[PDB]
Structures are given as structure tokens and as C-alpha cells.
């Protein structure tokens, strides 16, 4: 099975080609992870996938998406990860993070409280920042601030901080979040930058964010690991073609600052757009990327089917397979595919106190 | 559904009708349990189940299965589960513990480590004890000690020591471990147990060891918790119809006793025996202890296919149902079952994090 044969990138191997996306629990208190990360990371280790990238974990407070949410802000924050991070290197999982700003659509109610932003007379909530001050709309109607360079160089150093203290925690994979209309993404994007500096207008100067922080990280982040940034290609907003042609440019430009794979996704940046939601959705548009930025790729949407995960490795739409909410119902999905797609002693997905008894069950 | 209606036993209230049996680990060391129970027991009680009952705990050192079993026989011993006790509760499942002494059986290598009893230059190893000095045979052919008075009354305060330890550790359940040829069960068998003393010989003093253990242990257990015991009722042996009397007429003597349920298994005192396995091959019999000892009953065998464990609860064969190794496969068994049997709002069965998102998924 080509889901189960290991991926080397930079000193770094998985086991196998599954890998579990971020995925944000919004059980975190001031930014600080607790036992319920724990334990919820280090199960999902053990269930056998090559690949755990921790949740979207804030650079600064206020580029959480919710109260909720994890953060990294401070030495204190990184070390509380520790833990976690050995537990998953235990369990033969490679412990990643994605590091993330939520940009204008922070401030935000947790998914199953409202998923709106936070009203203004309620003590949870905070100003958000944007390249400018224009609402995404919708459900999260509030009018970022607009940053000042100075904002920028700040915002900038708060990525170079935490993708530091993710490296002295101990992860081995680092994930930049510019996608799904969070500050990265609304920086490249036309339809939440309006700026008339530096960092907005041209395509250079709307891939500037971006690549000034890639750049920036890649000076504290050890070489021998994998540099990774997740990134919305297209917004289904009827500009298909020409924003898939810019998004492939800036994945070579990202190639070429050091990236060594790409987390393709949509944009999510407006809420007016119309996704051709499906099983496997993404897989032409991942391996279009891959194939014209010459760039190892992973996406998601559906891979919780494994005839669908190994039918995209084989096709080489993609390098790894992020199956998310699958993992969610069935820590031990990986196991499962395993027996799916017949490999032999699939049981031996998971350790020993599991394996033993599993053995031809 | 009936498998996802409460349950009430003394003052405590299970959520559903599902309970995960005790499964031995492996992954203790000199018995003090680490990061690999509290992330496993935590990760299943958060999966749904009503009841969680901890693996085999052994009273004594020389009562462990093997060297990798959990041990509660000092108070720092104990004091090992209450962070997992706590994170059980926080997950709103009933945290259960059963305490144990293996008898004959102990002193064996890990089932994955060769399964058998330990070499006697093996400087892991220890001598065994049990009613008499007879061996299982087969893979565990060492002869124990015939135990004294003594060793009688020191195993007994052992089960004192644990329960009390259990309760201050904030344990709900506990469950007395008189099954699966360990030392209780081989009192009971006069396969294993040919005493000439107060301990062996008839009815009454092959019960007795038994009967006093659960009095001693009544003394310290709190009234209005549920105090269980795990029993073979039955060999497989061609001497069913017997046994089976006998072991109803022990079970009235244990709901006369203040045994609250029971836990209904087969003895596995001796190797040579036809059990006829298949899924919920237990059901009849643990249907006739419940009515003829009129005493709430679980067992196990099968229970993992949602079906079988409902049509069991809705004849009355059982009060709570045991799934084990389906947990193993798939922490989140309760959920899968809960989709399964129709269950309105299925996914609600696990914590928001996970439940909001699989909502119709
Ligand atoms: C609970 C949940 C939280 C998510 N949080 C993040 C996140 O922190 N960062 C991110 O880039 N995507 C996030 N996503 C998107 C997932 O990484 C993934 O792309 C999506 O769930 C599609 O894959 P699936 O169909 O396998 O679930 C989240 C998805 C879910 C279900
Ligand atoms: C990994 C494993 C360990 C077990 N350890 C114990 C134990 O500690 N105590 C006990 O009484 N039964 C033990 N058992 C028996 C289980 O509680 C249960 O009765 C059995 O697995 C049948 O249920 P199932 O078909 O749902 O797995 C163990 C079973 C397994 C698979």
C-alpha cells in the first residue's frame, strides 16, 4: 500500500503517509494547553499515523481565533507543550505544529457557542488586526484595525518567537498558517487587501507578508526540519484561473525561500464564494500545484475513505494524506485503513497493549 | 435504545449501559502505573462508555500476572491513580478498579513477551502462591507454594489494604477479581484447591476464602458505593451443570454479602476444557446467575457488534454490557454503537470537540 510506505523529508521520517492535520479544540485557557491536549495528542499518536501537526496555536493573543484557543506567545505557553511533545515522540508519531494568526477573524465564539464574533461588551473579546479595515462579513461582522508597519514587524517577530520556542519544545515540523482567510491569507488576497504600501497592491507586494515571514522563521528553525506553511490556491469566487496562477507563483517563491511542502487549501477569505464541496475535492487542484511548483504537497476534505487516500497517493496528486475528522470519530483510523487496504499485520498500526489482541480481529 | 439508558447502582449513575471490562496493559513498572494508562483511560472514558473499570491491580507484588502489571499495594502505589481517576470523572464516566492477586498464574512473561511463566533464573521472576501446590499445566507449569494460614490472612488484609486505598483515590467501582484462575477462582475449584483445612474440602470452605475476603473488604469499601466481583461460574470442564449450582448458590451468598452486581465469566482454573466460543456465547448463563441468584449481572465475549449487546439488554440477559478488545480497536466505540442503534444526536456521545463536528458525518 502506498499509504503505508514511510516519507523522508529533510532528517525527518514518517512512518507512513497519513498525516493528521491541525485541528482546533478550543479547550485551552489564556493561550495555555492543559490535559485535554494531552491526552487527546497523544492517543492520536498512538493510532498509528506518520504525521500529528498540533492545532492552530496563536503567535500572539490576539491572533487566536477564539478564547479557547492555544497559544505560544510566551516561554511559559511553549513550555507546556513539552510534555506533549514526548508523549507523541513516544508513541512514534512525528510531532508537528501549525503556528497561526487569526487575523480578522479572530475574537471569535468557539464553533458550538455562536461561531460568531465575540459582541463588544462581552469581557472575552479584543480588537483584531488586518492588512486593512475591512470586515470578512457575515457571521463575523467586526472591522479589524488596519496595522501599521510597525504592527507588521511585531506580528512578524511574534511567528520568529514562536516558531523558536516550538523548536526548543521539541517539535519536529513546523506548519505556517496562511491559509483560510487568517492574517497570512488576507495579506495575499485582493479581496482583504486594499493596502497602497509595501505590503499591498501588486503581487509582490501582496506575497511580501508572507514571504518576510517565511524568511524570517526559516532563521531560527533548524534546517534538518521540515519548514511547512498551509495556504489557500483559490477561493471558488469566480477568479479561478488567475488566482490559481498567482498561488502557484508564490508556491515557487515559497520553494524557493526554503519551503519543503505545501498544505494546499481553499482560501476561505469572503464568505460569498461557491466550493464544490466532494470526497477528495482537492486532489486535482493539490496536484496541479505540485506538479507547477515542483513542491510536495498535502491536502484534505474526505480522505477518511482509505480507497480514496491510497488512489490519491498512487496517482501522485499528493505526497501525504491529511485525514481530519475521521481521526476525530476514530482516534485509531490509521489502523483501520490499514485493515481496509490489507496490510499485513495491520494490527501492528498500534502498540503492543493494543496490537496483541487485534491480531487477525 | 437500551444500551444508552442510565444505570443506577447505590448512589452512583452511569450513562449509559455500556461498560469497558478490566484490560490488563502490560506497561506498568514495579506497579506503578505512568503515562500509558492515564492517556489510554482517559481517551476511553472521553470515547462515551458509561463505566470504565481499570485493569487487574494487583494487592501484593507476587499477585501481579507479569512484571508489567499494575500494582496498588503501598500508598504511593495508590496515589499513582488519582490523576487518572480525576481525568476519568472530568470525562463523566464512572472510574472502576479491579484488585486482583494472579495465585498460580502469576509470575508469567507478557502475552507478546512469550505468554508462559518466567524462567527460574530469570531474575524478574518470583515464587507463586496458591490454595495448593498444583500447577495449571501447559504454558504456566510451575508449582505454587501451598499458602499457610498466615499467607491466608495477609492476602486477605492485602484486599483490605487495596480497596482502601481505591476508595481514598477516589475510585467509584470496585470490583474483586474472583475470575479467570487467579487465586479466588482456584480457592472455589477443586481442580485447584484439595486443602484439608477450613479452606478446602467442601462447599462452604472452598467458599470461604471468597466470602471472607468480600466481608473484609465490605468493611472499608463505602456502603453506598457499588462493591463487584469478577467469577467463572462455570469450566467448560463436563462438570457444567454441577459447577453451575454451585456458583449461583456462592452468588447468594455474595448478594447476601452486600455484592452489589456480578461480573459473570468463565473459571479458566485449568487448561483442559471445550468452551464453545462465539459472540455472546455468555449470554444464557449470565441470564440464569441474574435470575436464579436474582443479582444484576455483566459479562463479555462479542458484545462489540451494537446489535448484540442491545438484543442482550432488551432480554434481560444482562444489566451492563462489556466491550472490550472493540475498545481497544476503537476508543470511541460508544459512538459508533450510538450511530449504529440510531441513537438521536449520536455524535453527542463524545465531548464538543469531537461531537460538533461529526454531527451528521
Ligand atoms: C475540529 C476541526 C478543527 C480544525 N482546525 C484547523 C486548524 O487548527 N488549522 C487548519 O489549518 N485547519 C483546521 N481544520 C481543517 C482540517 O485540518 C481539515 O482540513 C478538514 O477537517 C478537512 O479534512 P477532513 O475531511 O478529513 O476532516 C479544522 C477542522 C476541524 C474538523
Ligand atoms: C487486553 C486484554 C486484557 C485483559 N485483562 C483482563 C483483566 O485485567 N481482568 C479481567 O477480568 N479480564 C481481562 N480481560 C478480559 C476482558 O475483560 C473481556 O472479558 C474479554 O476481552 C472479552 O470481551 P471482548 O470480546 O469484548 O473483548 C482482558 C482482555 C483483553 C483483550
Not at 497561526?100 to 475574537?107: E, F, L, M, P, V
Not at 471558488?236 to 519551503?259: C, V
Not at 477518511?304 to 494524506?321: I, K, M, S
Amino acid at each position: 500500500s502506498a499509504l503505508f510506505e514511510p516519507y523522508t523529508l529533510k532528517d525527518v521520517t514518517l512512518r507512513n503517509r497519513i498525516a493528521i492535520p491541525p485541528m482546533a479544540q478550543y479547550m485551552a485557557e489564556d493561550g495555555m494547553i492543559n490535559d485535554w491536549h494531552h491526552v487527546h495528542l497523544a492517543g492520536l499518536a498512538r493510532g498509528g499515523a506518520g504525521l500529528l501537526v498540533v492545532e492552530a496555536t496563536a503567535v500572539a493573543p490576539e491572533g487566536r481565533i477564539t478564547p479557547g484557543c492555544a497559544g505560544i506567545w510566551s516561554d511559559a505557553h511553549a513550555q507546556a507543550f513539552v510534555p506533549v511533545v514526548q508523549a507523541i515522540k513516544a508513541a512514534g508519531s512525528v510531532p508537528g505544529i501549525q503556528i497561526a494568526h487569526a487575523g480578522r477573524k479572530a475574537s471569535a465564539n468557539r464553533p458550538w457557542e455562536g461561531d460568531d464574533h465575540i459582541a463588544a461588551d462581552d469581557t472575552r473579546g479584543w480588537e483584531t488586526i488586518a492588512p486593512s479595515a475591512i470586515a470578512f462579513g457575515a457571521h463575523l461582522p467586526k472591522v479589524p484595525r488596519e496595522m501599521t508597519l510597525d504592527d507588521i514587524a511585531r506580528v512578524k517577530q511574534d511567528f520568529v518567537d514562536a516558531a523558536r520556542r516550538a523548536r526548543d519544545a521539541g517539535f519536529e515540523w513546523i506548519e505556517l498558517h496562511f491559509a483560510h482567510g487568517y492574517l497570512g491569507q488576507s495579506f495575499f488576497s485582493e479581496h482583504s487587501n486594499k493596502r497602497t504600501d509595501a505590503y499591498g497592491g501588486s503581487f509582490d507586494n501582496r506575497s511580501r507578508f508572507l514571504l518576510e515571514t517565511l524568511a524570517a522563521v526559516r532563521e531560527v528553525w533548524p534546517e534538518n526540519l521540515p519548514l511547512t506553511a498551509r495556504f489557500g490556491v483559490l477561493e471558488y469566487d469566480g477568479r479561478d484561473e488567475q488566482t490559481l496562477e498567482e498561488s502557484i507563483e508564490l508556491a515557487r517563491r515559497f520553494k524557493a525561500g526554503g519551503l519543503d511542502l505545501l498544505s494546499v487549501s481553499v482560501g476561505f477569505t469572503i464568505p460569498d464564494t461557491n466550493i464544490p464541496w466532494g470526497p477528495a475535492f482537492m486532489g486535482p487542484i493539490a496536484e496541479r500545484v505540485r506538479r507547477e511548483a515542483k513542491l510536495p504537497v498535502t491536502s484534505a476534505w474526505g480522505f477518511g475513505t482509505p480507497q480514496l487516500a491510497e488512489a490519491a497517493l498512487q496517482a501522485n496528486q499528493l505526497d501525504l494524506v491529511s485525514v481530519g475528522r475521521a481521526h476525530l470519530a476514530d482516534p485509531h483510523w490509521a489502523y483501520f485503513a490499514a485493515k481496509e487496504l490489507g496490510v499485513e499485520k495491520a494490527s501492528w498500526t498500534l502498540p503492543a497493549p493494543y496490537a496483541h489482541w487485534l491480531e487477525r480481529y
